[PDB]
Amino acid sequence: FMVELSPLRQDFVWGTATSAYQIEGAVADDGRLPSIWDTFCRVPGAIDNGDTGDVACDSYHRWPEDLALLKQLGVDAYRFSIAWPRVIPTGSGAVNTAGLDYYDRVVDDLLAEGIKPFVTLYHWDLPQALQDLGGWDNRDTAYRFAEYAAVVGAKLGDRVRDWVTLNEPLCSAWIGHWEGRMAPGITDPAIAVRASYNLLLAHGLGVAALRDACPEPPAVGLVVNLSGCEPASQSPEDIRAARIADGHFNRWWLDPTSGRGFPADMVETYGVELPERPGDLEIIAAPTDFIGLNYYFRQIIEADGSVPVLGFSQVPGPNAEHTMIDWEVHPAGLEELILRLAKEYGAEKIYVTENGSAWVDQPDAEFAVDDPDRTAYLEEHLAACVRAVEQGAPLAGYFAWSLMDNFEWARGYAPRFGLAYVDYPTGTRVMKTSGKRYADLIRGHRE
């Protein structure tokens, strides 16, 4: 199968993405202080194989090698994140000049190569010092985030015009505070729900902060990882369970940011008093200029009385193709979600801000990798995007996760999502077949 991209407008944005803690390394260099992920990596058993982000791809010291990869791809845009603990290391007060200078230089270099920066402000690396004050269970943290946004926007917002506030708040809140499998490893539904609230508040405050501080008007949006939630059977119990999952994973985030309040069925399900103050809902619903869709899989949901509060469990998806981390391959789910955002939520501009897959790579002695399953996954999901556009969805661009192999959080380095292979001992980056195919597809679309 070879995807046909001609229905996409010529101003479609072709991109690829990383995040700071997953690639940068240099965790104690040039004024950086620890984030909650630094701390989580010191907990025995938290990260598969005991991996850490101490070095990762060393992109703090090897940024030009990333830029060479980006030039090889020929992308229009690069989505990367700013490390909060590199810029305001304690999360309050003093700005760390060297940290901010690094990102200033990254922005200049991208623009010199004709690549637009798409900057994520919060990609999970909360400064540990703010976690020592309660972290996302402390409303103050949202105001700290807004202060940070204003510092970054004032510095970079003459050149950066496209901003993401938070990446995947579901992950921070539910997996970081309910399941405990991500930093800070808390396992408490009431804290998790309150953290979800203060995260959404931080998003709205950050929108306002950017519009106030950027020297040129920003385009700002939230990034949410969405998953179609479908019942394992047509029993009434399974149908309602899948709908509760849809609230938990999708509507909890989409509804209040769209001005629809928090969904009543989920408020009732959680039974947690939201830490709400007058005017908060209008802040959370701050007007945005796009929505960022991260998509990897749908979820098949069954009713499950053994799961406290939620009462549902995910079961394996039925498609034959699954990635190395057992994520079902289902490109139709991407088309559907793009359309839902366009039709059910009236989104005026949608980016796919993450999509990609992890497979077992077999590098040769020079780290060349031929990865036909990763390539085919890319091609099928691009075809799903094309079909959503043919059906009227305002899809403005696509960002492949990821530019290169990197630290995949609690799974460590084992899942390689890169279009480029990374030999971690040397930092050597070598484009895989998938990356070369992506470059060929971009060039073909533009011709």
mmCIF file of N, CA and C in Angstrom, residues 55-133:
data_model
loop_
_atom_site.group_PDB
_atom_site.id
_atom_site.type_symbol
_atom_site.label_atom_id
_atom_site.label_comp_id
_atom_site.label_asym_id
_atom_site.label_seq_id
_atom_site.Cartn_x
_atom_site.Cartn_y
_atom_site.Cartn_z
ATOM 1 N N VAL A 55 20.680 10.616 30.442
ATOM 2 C CA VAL A 55 21.403 10.894 29.210
ATOM 3 C C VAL A 55 20.472 10.929 28.005
ATOM 4 N N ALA A 56 19.603 9.927 27.873
ATOM 5 C CA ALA A 56 18.620 9.841 26.782
ATOM 6 C C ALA A 56 19.366 9.996 25.456
ATOM 7 N N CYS A 57 18.948 10.899 24.571
ATOM 8 C CA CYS A 57 19.632 11.119 23.307
ATOM 9 C C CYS A 57 20.665 12.226 23.392
ATOM 10 N N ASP A 58 20.855 12.823 24.573
ATOM 11 C CA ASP A 58 21.841 13.888 24.748
ATOM 12 C C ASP A 58 21.560 15.081 23.835
ATOM 13 N N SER A 59 20.278 15.351 23.544
ATOM 14 C CA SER A 59 19.923 16.439 22.633
ATOM 15 C C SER A 59 20.271 17.820 23.182
ATOM 16 N N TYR A 60 20.461 17.955 24.495
ATOM 17 C CA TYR A 60 20.932 19.238 25.008
ATOM 18 C C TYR A 60 22.308 19.569 24.437
ATOM 19 N N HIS A 61 23.196 18.580 24.366
ATOM 20 C CA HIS A 61 24.531 18.787 23.822
ATOM 21 C C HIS A 61 24.639 18.451 22.339
ATOM 22 N N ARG A 62 23.665 17.722 21.775
ATOM 23 C CA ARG A 62 23.736 17.233 20.403
ATOM 24 C C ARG A 62 22.582 17.748 19.549
ATOM 25 N N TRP A 63 21.992 18.876 19.926
ATOM 26 C CA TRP A 63 20.930 19.479 19.118
ATOM 27 C C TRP A 63 21.243 19.542 17.619
ATOM 28 N N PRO A 64 22.449 19.916 17.166
ATOM 29 C CA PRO A 64 22.688 19.965 15.713
ATOM 30 C C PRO A 64 22.456 18.640 15.001
ATOM 31 N N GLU A 65 22.645 17.500 15.677
ATOM 32 C CA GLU A 65 22.373 16.209 15.047
ATOM 33 C C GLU A 65 20.869 15.984 14.862
ATOM 34 N N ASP A 66 20.060 16.470 15.813
ATOM 35 C CA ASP A 66 18.611 16.500 15.620
ATOM 36 C C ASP A 66 18.247 17.379 14.432
ATOM 37 N N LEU A 67 18.854 18.568 14.347
ATOM 38 C CA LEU A 67 18.549 19.455 13.225
ATOM 39 C C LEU A 67 18.904 18.801 11.889
ATOM 40 N N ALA A 68 20.034 18.085 11.827
ATOM 41 C CA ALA A 68 20.364 17.344 10.606
ATOM 42 C C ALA A 68 19.279 16.332 10.256
ATOM 43 N N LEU A 69 18.759 15.602 11.256
ATOM 44 C CA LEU A 69 17.639 14.698 10.965
ATOM 45 C C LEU A 69 16.430 15.456 10.413
ATOM 46 N N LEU A 70 16.095 16.595 11.030
ATOM 47 C CA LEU A 70 14.930 17.367 10.602
ATOM 48 C C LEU A 70 15.093 17.856 9.169
ATOM 49 N N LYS A 71 16.301 18.304 8.815
ATOM 50 C CA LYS A 71 16.564 18.698 7.437
ATOM 51 C C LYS A 71 16.433 17.509 6.496
ATOM 52 N N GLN A 72 16.929 16.341 6.911
ATOM 53 C CA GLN A 72 16.786 15.152 6.076
ATOM 54 C C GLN A 72 15.317 14.814 5.820
ATOM 55 N N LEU A 73 14.454 14.982 6.832
ATOM 56 C CA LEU A 73 13.029 14.688 6.649
ATOM 57 C C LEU A 73 12.353 15.686 5.722
ATOM 58 N N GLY A 74 12.832 16.929 5.704
ATOM 59 C CA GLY A 74 12.156 17.979 4.973
ATOM 60 C C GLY A 74 10.832 18.412 5.566
ATOM 61 N N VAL A 75 10.631 18.232 6.878
ATOM 62 C CA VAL A 75 9.383 18.657 7.517
ATOM 63 C C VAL A 75 9.254 20.177 7.486
ATOM 64 N N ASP A 76 7.999 20.652 7.484
ATOM 65 C CA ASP A 76 7.684 22.066 7.659
ATOM 66 C C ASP A 76 7.813 22.529 9.103
ATOM 67 N N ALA A 77 7.677 21.624 10.067
ATOM 68 C CA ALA A 77 7.543 22.039 11.455
ATOM 69 C C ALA A 77 8.151 20.992 12.375
ATOM 70 N N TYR A 78 8.576 21.452 13.548
ATOM 71 C CA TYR A 78 9.157 20.595 14.569
ATOM 72 C C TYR A 78 8.450 20.888 15.879
ATOM 73 N N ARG A 79 7.825 19.866 16.450
ATOM 74 C CA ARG A 79 7.171 19.972 17.745
ATOM 75 C C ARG A 79 8.136 19.484 18.825
ATOM 76 N N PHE A 80 8.511 20.376 19.736
ATOM 77 C CA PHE A 80 9.396 20.016 20.836
ATOM 78 C C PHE A 80 8.866 20.675 22.096
ATOM 79 N N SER A 81 9.394 20.271 23.247
ATOM 80 C CA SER A 81 8.912 20.848 24.492
ATOM 81 C C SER A 81 10.044 21.580 25.196
ATOM 82 N N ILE A 82 9.658 22.570 25.988
ATOM 83 C CA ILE A 82 10.556 23.303 26.870
ATOM 84 C C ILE A 82 10.573 22.600 28.217
ATOM 85 N N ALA A 83 11.762 22.421 28.785
ATOM 86 C CA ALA A 83 11.877 21.853 30.122
ATOM 87 C C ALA A 83 11.695 22.972 31.143
ATOM 88 N N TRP A 84 10.525 23.003 31.787
ATOM 89 C CA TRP A 84 10.279 23.921 32.900
ATOM 90 C C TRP A 84 11.416 23.945 33.914
ATOM 91 N N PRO A 85 11.936 22.809 34.402
ATOM 92 C CA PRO A 85 13.018 22.879 35.400
ATOM 93 C C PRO A 85 14.352 23.319 34.825
ATOM 94 N N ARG A 86 14.454 23.482 33.507
ATOM 95 C CA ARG A 86 15.623 24.101 32.907
ATOM 96 C C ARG A 86 15.493 25.616 32.838
ATOM 97 N N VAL A 87 14.270 26.132 32.790
ATOM 98 C CA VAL A 87 14.012 27.556 32.592
ATOM 99 C C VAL A 87 13.728 28.270 33.909
ATOM 100 N N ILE A 88 12.872 27.692 34.746
ATOM 101 C CA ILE A 88 12.616 28.206 36.092
ATOM 102 C C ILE A 88 12.828 27.021 37.028
ATOM 103 N N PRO A 89 14.082 26.746 37.411
ATOM 104 C CA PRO A 89 14.422 25.434 37.997
ATOM 105 C C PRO A 89 13.652 25.053 39.253
ATOM 106 N N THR A 90 13.361 25.997 40.145
ATOM 107 C CA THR A 90 12.542 25.695 41.311
ATOM 108 C C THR A 90 11.053 25.777 41.028
ATOM 109 N N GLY A 91 10.656 26.188 39.831
ATOM 110 C CA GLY A 91 9.257 26.419 39.556
ATOM 111 C C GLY A 91 8.722 27.762 40.008
ATOM 112 N N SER A 92 9.532 28.579 40.686
ATOM 113 C CA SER A 92 9.133 29.930 41.048
ATOM 114 C C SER A 92 10.360 30.830 41.010
ATOM 115 N N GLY A 93 10.114 32.131 40.892
ATOM 116 C CA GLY A 93 11.176 33.108 41.040
ATOM 117 C C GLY A 93 12.164 33.196 39.893
ATOM 118 N N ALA A 94 13.423 32.852 40.167
ATOM 119 C CA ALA A 94 14.523 33.165 39.260
ATOM 120 C C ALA A 94 14.451 32.369 37.960
ATOM 121 N N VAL A 95 14.707 33.063 36.837
ATOM 122 C CA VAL A 95 14.828 32.443 35.522
ATOM 123 C C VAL A 95 16.282 32.045 35.298
ATOM 124 N N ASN A 96 16.493 30.829 34.789
ATOM 125 C CA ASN A 96 17.824 30.292 34.516
ATOM 126 C C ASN A 96 18.221 30.666 33.092
ATOM 127 N N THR A 97 19.075 31.686 32.964
ATOM 128 C CA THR A 97 19.358 32.281 31.654
ATOM 129 C C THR A 97 19.891 31.258 30.650
ATOM 130 N N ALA A 98 20.837 30.407 31.066
ATOM 131 C CA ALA A 98 21.431 29.456 30.125
ATOM 132 C C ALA A 98 20.391 28.479 29.584
ATOM 133 N N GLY A 99 19.459 28.059 30.442
ATOM 134 C CA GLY A 99 18.417 27.151 29.990
ATOM 135 C C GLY A 99 17.547 27.773 28.917
ATOM 136 N N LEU A 100 17.088 29.005 29.154
ATOM 137 C CA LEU A 100 16.258 29.690 28.167
ATOM 138 C C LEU A 100 17.028 29.963 26.877
ATOM 139 N N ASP A 101 18.328 30.283 27.000
ATOM 140 C CA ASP A 101 19.169 30.531 25.829
ATOM 141 C C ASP A 101 19.230 29.316 24.915
ATOM 142 N N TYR A 102 19.315 28.110 25.494
ATOM 143 C CA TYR A 102 19.317 26.899 24.671
ATOM 144 C C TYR A 102 18.111 26.860 23.723
ATOM 145 N N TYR A 103 16.910 27.120 24.250
ATOM 146 C CA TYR A 103 15.719 27.068 23.402
ATOM 147 C C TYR A 103 15.666 28.248 22.440
ATOM 148 N N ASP A 104 16.141 29.425 22.866
ATOM 149 C CA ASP A 104 16.254 30.549 21.937
ATOM 150 C C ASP A 104 17.102 30.180 20.719
ATOM 151 N N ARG A 105 18.236 29.512 20.959
ATOM 152 C CA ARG A 105 19.109 29.087 19.869
ATOM 153 C C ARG A 105 18.449 28.019 19.010
ATOM 154 N N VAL A 106 17.753 27.063 19.637
ATOM 155 C CA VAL A 106 17.019 26.057 18.868
ATOM 156 C C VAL A 106 16.033 26.728 17.911
ATOM 157 N N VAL A 107 15.284 27.717 18.410
ATOM 158 C CA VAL A 107 14.303 28.419 17.579
ATOM 159 C C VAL A 107 14.988 29.098 16.394
ATOM 160 N N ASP A 108 16.075 29.835 16.662
ATOM 161 C CA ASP A 108 16.782 30.497 15.565
ATOM 162 C C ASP A 108 17.270 29.494 14.521
ATOM 163 N N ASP A 109 17.831 28.362 14.962
ATOM 164 C CA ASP A 109 18.355 27.364 14.015
ATOM 165 C C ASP A 109 17.249 26.742 13.159
ATOM 166 N N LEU A 110 16.123 26.385 13.791
ATOM 167 C CA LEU A 110 14.984 25.868 13.037
ATOM 168 C C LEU A 110 14.569 26.853 11.959
ATOM 169 N N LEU A 111 14.375 28.115 12.349
ATOM 170 C CA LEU A 111 13.906 29.115 11.400
ATOM 171 C C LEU A 111 14.915 29.333 10.283
ATOM 172 N N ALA A 112 16.210 29.286 10.610
ATOM 173 C CA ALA A 112 17.229 29.395 9.573
ATOM 174 C C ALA A 112 17.117 28.263 8.560
ATOM 175 N N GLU A 113 16.632 27.086 8.976
ATOM 176 C CA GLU A 113 16.404 26.006 8.014
ATOM 177 C C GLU A 113 14.980 25.989 7.453
ATOM 178 N N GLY A 114 14.190 27.031 7.697
ATOM 179 C CA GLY A 114 12.826 27.056 7.200
ATOM 180 C C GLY A 114 11.869 26.104 7.888
ATOM 181 N N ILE A 115 12.109 25.780 9.157
ATOM 182 C CA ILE A 115 11.257 24.870 9.919
ATOM 183 C C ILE A 115 10.569 25.668 11.022
ATOM 184 N N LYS A 116 9.244 25.556 11.104
ATOM 185 C CA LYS A 116 8.466 26.265 12.129
ATOM 186 C C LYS A 116 8.533 25.540 13.475
ATOM 187 N N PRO A 117 8.844 26.243 14.566
ATOM 188 C CA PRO A 117 8.773 25.626 15.902
ATOM 189 C C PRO A 117 7.333 25.554 16.401
ATOM 190 N N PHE A 118 6.928 24.372 16.873
ATOM 191 C CA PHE A 118 5.654 24.152 17.573
ATOM 192 C C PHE A 118 6.032 23.777 19.004
ATOM 193 N N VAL A 119 5.874 24.708 19.936
ATOM 194 C CA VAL A 119 6.463 24.585 21.264
ATOM 195 C C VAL A 119 5.419 24.103 22.266
ATOM 196 N N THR A 120 5.719 22.990 22.928
ATOM 197 C CA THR A 120 4.946 22.521 24.071
ATOM 198 C C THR A 120 5.559 23.066 25.358
ATOM 199 N N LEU A 121 4.739 23.725 26.187
ATOM 200 C CA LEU A 121 5.253 24.289 27.440
ATOM 201 C C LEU A 121 5.409 23.227 28.524
ATOM 202 N N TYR A 122 4.378 22.397 28.734
ATOM 203 C CA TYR A 122 4.391 21.378 29.781
ATOM 204 C C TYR A 122 4.288 19.997 29.160
ATOM 205 N N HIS A 123 5.386 19.250 29.207
ATOM 206 C CA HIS A 123 5.355 17.880 28.740
ATOM 207 C C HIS A 123 5.798 16.955 29.867
ATOM 208 N N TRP A 124 5.184 17.121 31.047
ATOM 209 C CA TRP A 124 5.170 16.210 32.196
ATOM 210 C C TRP A 124 6.303 16.444 33.182
ATOM 211 N N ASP A 125 7.300 17.252 32.840
ATOM 212 C CA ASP A 125 8.477 17.389 33.696
ATOM 213 C C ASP A 125 8.293 18.531 34.701
ATOM 214 N N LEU A 126 7.287 18.368 35.556
ATOM 215 C CA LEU A 126 7.061 19.327 36.629
ATOM 216 C C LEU A 126 8.313 19.436 37.499
ATOM 217 N N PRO A 127 8.784 20.647 37.814
ATOM 218 C CA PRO A 127 9.912 20.775 38.750
ATOM 219 C C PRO A 127 9.608 20.070 40.061
ATOM 220 N N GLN A 128 10.558 19.238 40.508
ATOM 221 C CA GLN A 128 10.368 18.522 41.765
ATOM 222 C C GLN A 128 10.081 19.482 42.911
ATOM 223 N N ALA A 129 10.667 20.688 42.878
ATOM 224 C CA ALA A 129 10.423 21.651 43.950
ATOM 225 C C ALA A 129 8.943 22.012 44.058
ATOM 226 N N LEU A 130 8.223 22.050 42.932
ATOM 227 C CA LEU A 130 6.789 22.320 43.012
ATOM 228 C C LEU A 130 6.015 21.111 43.522
ATOM 229 N N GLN A 131 6.462 19.901 43.172
ATOM 230 C CA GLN A 131 5.867 18.693 43.732
ATOM 231 C C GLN A 131 6.034 18.633 45.244
ATOM 232 N N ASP A 132 7.150 19.150 45.767
ATOM 233 C CA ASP A 132 7.357 19.222 47.208
ATOM 234 C C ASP A 132 6.380 20.172 47.895
ATOM 235 N N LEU A 133 5.637 20.975 47.133
ATOM 236 C CA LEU A 133 4.564 21.820 47.653
ATOM 237 C C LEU A 133 3.184 21.235 47.383
#
